[PDB]
Design a protein around this ligand. Structure first.
Ligand SMILES: NC(=O)c1ccc[n+]([C@@H]2O[C@H](COP(=O)([O-])OP(=O)(O)OC[C@H]3O[C@@H](n4cnc5c(N)ncnc54)[C@H](OP(=O)(O)O)[C@@H]3O)[C@@H](O)[C@H]2O)c1
Ligand SMILES: NC(=O)c1ccc[n+]([C@@H]2O[C@H](COP(=O)([O-])OP(=O)(O)OC[C@H]3O[C@@H](n4cnc5c(N)ncnc54)[C@H](OP(=O)(O)O)[C@@H]3O)[C@@H](O)[C@H]2O)c1
Ligand SMILES: O=C(O)CCC(=O)C(=O)O
Ligand SMILES: O=C(O)CCC(=O)C(=O)O
Ligand SMILES: [Mg+2]
Ligand SMILES: [Mg+2]
Lengths: 414, 414
């Protein structure tokens, strides 16, 4: 095992769904491939400064490197891309952070980000998107976007259940569908690839339960179930209907005049929360035209994959969008962008995706005060037009900063 | 049969993939449900005026109403939503136009727009999107968007091959996948719905063939295959690879330095056309940030469904986006928006989606001169800030017009 546990840290423990976070917690981190070598050192500098400015010395994180991706073959052997040890270790230390990851081609494995998500049963991909004043945006009014995506991570088409065209197994599957199930709707059965998309009662409800609980705790105004439920009646329509049934049964929602929309009342607050639904293709237009009407969004794995990237772009956040995959027994926060090898080692890219996922991390842990400091920091740096090439390209009069230098500018504005 | 063929028209005939369009062609049209009662009369006024201003009297269309949707039950019986007669008739008269359509709930049928597409084997959904100067847009620079989507219409998840959770058939399908195929990747097998997504060699290639032929005839600069090919290796990755193989083999494309991008040379023109690919979620960001780098887009059925609505929105075109479903033996042009019953009969909505799909219609037919007139018309009306409520809501100083009045304003600016 080649991980070295810090000598002075202590482990987070989970007691009754609530975290027990010590003053010296050990947090494992995965450096990441590609530009992970640039953004990750900046996020450690900055999380470390945010806990010192905040808790004035009492709290310290003991960071612990663990491995996945190309940096793990360089450490464990040519063919070890996801060591079982990292899975045990994220479950054991309960909270962790990672940078971008390379999956090699063909060679068995799925996509390492999905493999972690699924193997560790991290069913909530929580990706909030919000505007930071100052970001170059391609949209006229990007400040209307404050949204939070709850993307179901354990099923949908992402389960990887598929077969290559013309292989024996694909043909078996199609002899099955035609002969045993009476399926006449395949246009070209020869030279045809097949994939299976599953959507289940427990899988959508644990996600929507999470989404409506997230709305109540943070006093948000609506939850939108988005779906292409009119073509995919039983995976995606069932997703809309189960989500409505969950808000009636467990949250006591009741009809708004004709319906279908339900109103769930916030028990801590009195405000009513709307549970509504939008067909998925009209949603991608609604988020650009009426973006103030939407808030928490709940969806299956593929739709959420796309909604979040569309949303991140309109607010000018391709490179600063945060992300977290959360399950019942642990969480893994991540940079949402790729590895970008062209720019690796050159200290120029924007480190704000992983830093803002460290914000989510701390907030999860309960160190709200360090986490609000990291967003005070980043709102200052961007507003001082002090920024990395990606934002400098598009801006009228800014100071170009290296990636390390931008972490310092965040510490500077706390 | 309750269709009445015009006394004076003549039928378009197809000879060697080329259309023979007489001076008096009969064109069937479907009025549409909901606001189809408002926009369709405006499109007939305007196509009729555009052929008279253009061909000064020699050419006349003989319009022929046919039926699908709610207006067909009112004509054929409570349960007749898609008369076999309309399918025979679109195939027979070769070209047709429709407004928005209602599909009832549950009661068997799929979604009538898809049922036509599929039953009539209309494999190309061609949806071009372009900015008309003057449209209220939510994006800063919407004029950079000139794109053309080629969406595969006959397969992908849209084939409707799916089973309800807990039904006997779904369980059969899962006893099959676990027991016979060795599938361990379903998270919750009980209470699970299943859908099948097929993607085939002939289906993607007839679409990409069409897309690269469309690029060469119109002198466009690139074709982008978009796909989530890294999770769906065999439906969607195969889509990327077959599309590349088609441009090497049939169009003689050759590598750009490292590749993967191929360059196909336009035989009529000398310009080189780039065939490139973008993973689908990065595409939804690339279209908002670098929109000038993309042009003709080729994709499977679900991705295209979403790309086009995202694109239509950024240029301010929710209600003016044109559409066409094209096959080898006929075409059916359509309004892309819904029925909107709230506003039906009130003459207020925007008729520019079906009118701009009539533009595509004429262009297809070869009446280029009437078709360029209809876009001269619509660029004048919008630029004279003379417009329907949807655009008047968002605009600084315009004349509000009824839907019929807006068709007149288009005739006025030809
Ligand atoms: O690999 P990938 O996946 O190809 O990510 C795509 C692109 O987005 C940009 N990008 C990725 N991560 C970023 C980050 N953290 N900060 C700024 N830009 C980032 C770069 O765009 P550009 O190359 O356009 O700067 C990069 O080539
Ligand atoms: O049914 P649908 O499907 O719900 O279409 C959605 C909405 O887009 C708008 N819409 C649909 N067709 C339109 C058209 N032809 N012109 C202008 N707006 C249109 C209306 O938006 P709004 O109700 O926002 O005007 C309509 O309620
Ligand atoms: O990079 C990958 O592993 C694909 C994942 C992806 O788009 C994501 O997590 O959003
Ligand atoms: O209205 C329908 O039939 C669904 C179709 C749809 O979004 C479309 O054709 O783009
Ligand atoms: Mg993604
Ligand atoms: Mg659509």
């Amino acid at each position: 095992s080649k991980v070295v546990v810090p000598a002075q840290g202590k482990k987070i423990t989970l007691q009754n769904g609530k975290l027990n976070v010590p003053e010296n917690p050990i947090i494992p981190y995965i450096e990441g491939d590609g530009i992970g070598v640039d953004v990750t050192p900046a996020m450690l500098k900055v999380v470390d400064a945010a806990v010192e400015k905040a808790y004035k010395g009492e709290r310290k994180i003991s960071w612990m490197e663990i491995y996945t991706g190309e940096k793990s073959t360089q450490v464990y052997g040519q063919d070890v891309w996801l060591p079982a040890e990292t899975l045990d270790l994220i479950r054991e230390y309960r909270v962790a952070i990672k940078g971008p990851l390379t999956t090699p081609v063909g060679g068995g494995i799925r996509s390492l980000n999905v493999a972690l998500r699924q193997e560790l049963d991290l069913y909530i991909c929580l990706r909030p998107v919000r505007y930071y004043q100052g970001t170059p945006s391609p949209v006229k009014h990007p400040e209307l976007t404050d949204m939070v995506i709850f993307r179901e991570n354990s099923e949908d088409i992402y389960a990887g259940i598929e077969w290559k065209a013309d292989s024996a197994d694909a043909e078996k599957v199609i002899k099955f569908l035609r002969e045993e199930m009476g399926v006449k709707k395949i246009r070209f059965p020869e030279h045809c690839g097949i994939g299976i998309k599953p959507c289940s009662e427990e899988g959508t409800k644990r996600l929507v339960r999470a989404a409506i609980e997230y709305a109540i705790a943070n006093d948000r105004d609506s939850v939108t179930l988005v779906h292409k439920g009119n073509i995919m009646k039983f995976t995606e329509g069932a997703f809309k209907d189960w989500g409505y049934q969950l808000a009636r049964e467990e949250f006591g929602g009741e009809l708004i005049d004709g319906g279908p929309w339900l109103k769930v009342k916030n028990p801590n607050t009195g405000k009513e929360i709307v549970i509504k639904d939008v067909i998925a293709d009209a949603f991608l237009q609604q988020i650009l035209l009426r973006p103030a009407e939407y808030d928490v969004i709940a969806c299956m794995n593929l739709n959420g994959d796309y909604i979040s990237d569309a949303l991140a772009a309109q607010v000018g956040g391709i490179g600063i969008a945060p992300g977290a995959n959360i399950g019942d027994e642990c969480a893994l926060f991540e940079a949402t962008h790729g590895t970008a090898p062209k720019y690796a080692g050159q200290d120029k890219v924007n480190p704000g995706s992983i830093i803002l996922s460290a914000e989510m991390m701390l907030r999860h842990m309960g160190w709200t005060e360090a986490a609000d400091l990291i967003v005070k920091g980043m709102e200052g740096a961007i507003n001082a037009k002090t920024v990395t090439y990606d934002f400098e390209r598009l801006m009228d009069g800014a100071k170009l900063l290296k990636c390390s230098e931008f972490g310092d500018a965040i510490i500077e504005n706390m």
